[PDB]
Amino acid sequence: NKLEDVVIDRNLLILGKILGEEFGSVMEGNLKQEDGTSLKVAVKTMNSSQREIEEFLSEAACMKDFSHPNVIRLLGVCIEKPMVILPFMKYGDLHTYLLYSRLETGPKHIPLQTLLKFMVDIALGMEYLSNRNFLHRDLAARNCMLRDDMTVCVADFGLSMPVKWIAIESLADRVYTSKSDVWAFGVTMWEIATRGMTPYPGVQNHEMYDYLLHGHRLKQPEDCLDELYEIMYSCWRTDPLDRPTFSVLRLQLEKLLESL
Numbered sequence: 281n282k283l284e285d286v287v288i289d290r291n292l293l294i295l296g297k298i299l300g301e302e303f304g305s306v307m308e309g310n311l312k313q314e315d316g317t318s319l320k321v322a323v324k325t326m327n328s329s330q331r332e333i334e335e336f337l338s339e340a341a342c343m344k345d346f347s348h349p350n351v352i353r354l355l356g357v358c359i360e361k362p363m364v365i366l367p368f369m370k371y372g373d374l375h376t377y378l379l380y381s382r383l384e385t386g387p388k389h390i391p392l393q394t395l396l397k398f399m400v401d402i403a404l405g406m407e408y409l410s411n412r413n414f415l416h417r418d419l420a421a422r423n424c425m426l427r428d429d430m431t432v433c434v435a436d437f438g439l440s441m442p443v444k445w446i447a448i449e450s451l452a453d454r455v456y457t458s459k460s461d462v463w464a465f466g467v468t469m470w471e472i473a474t475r476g477m478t479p480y481p482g483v484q485n486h487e488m489y490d491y492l493l494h495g496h497r498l499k500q501p502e503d504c505l506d507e508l509y510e511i512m513y514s515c516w517r518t519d520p521l522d523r524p525t526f527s528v529l530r531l532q533l534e535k536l537l538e539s540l
């Protein structure tokens with residue numbers, strides 16, 4: 281009953297072109313605001329029990345209350361069939377951006393100081409979520425969005441295959457904790473320092489557990505500072521408990537950036 285303040289009236293929403301397509305489609309849209317003005321949004325669609333539907337609205341109400349510059353907001357949900365409504369980020373996801381920087385007509389070559397700042401943004405957003413015991417469960421550069429001022433925010437968390445982002449302990453069992461998000465953040469850092477390489481070249485998805493079980497990890501990128509590799513490497517320690525917290529990671533990266 282009380283969790284209806286997360287619901288948006290359908291006729292305040294206009295749906296346009298598809299941005300992306302398995303168990304959902306994401307579309308551009310316009311949302312009319314209490315302001316009277318209209319905002320550009322991205323809309324992701326997704327039993328029929330009353331117990332299961334309240335569990336969704338609660339989670340959504342939770343996410344709508346998140347307010348941090350490095351965490352994307354949930355604007356609300358429309359129910360026709362549920363659709364979650366997020367602000368549209370014109371500059372798109374960090375992974376594509378990273379690939380474009382390696383091509384003419386894309387952003388310029390991204391210097392080290394900018395790549396590190398991206399990692400600090402993501403660490404902060406992750407620290408914010410972790411502080412609220414909210415597991416992300418799908419961190420990767422493709423899920424880090426660029427705001428119009430070029431700050432990075434984490435996205436596509438909560439509300440419920442990317443094998444190469446999944447921590448060893450989570451491959452082995454049905455186990456996902458904050459330390460698994462930390463593993464994923466290391467992979468995301470590696471994606472950023474490689475300017476968008478797919479993790480583990482030469483390793484196939486189905487080989488990933490055997491490969492990790494043998495103690496192999498993502499290799500240091502060619503010209504990336506030893507200090508930076510040490511930080512990402514600590515994210516993949518076999519024992520989840522030996523991995524640093526996000527608060528620890530975030531300060532390590534700030535101090536590294538500050539040193540340059």
Ligand SMILES: Nc1ncnc2c1ncn2[C@@H]1O[C@H](COP(=O)(O)OP(=O)(O)O)[C@@H](O)[C@H]1O
Nearest residue numbers: 299300301306322366367368369372373422423
């Ligand atoms: N809030 C948003 N604003 C703008 N584009 C978005 C937003 N959320 C997702 N997208 C884009 O829509 C497409 C589909 O997103 P998604 O289904 O989350 O796929 P992916 O697996 O690439 O992250 C992607 O290209 C993604 O970058």
Ligand SMILES: [Cl-]
Nearest residue numbers: 475476477478
């Ligand atoms: Cl590549």
Ligand SMILES: [Cl-]
Nearest residue numbers: 480481498499
């Ligand atoms: Cl590798």
Ligand SMILES: [Mg+2]
Nearest residue numbers: 422423435436
């Ligand atoms: Mg996504």
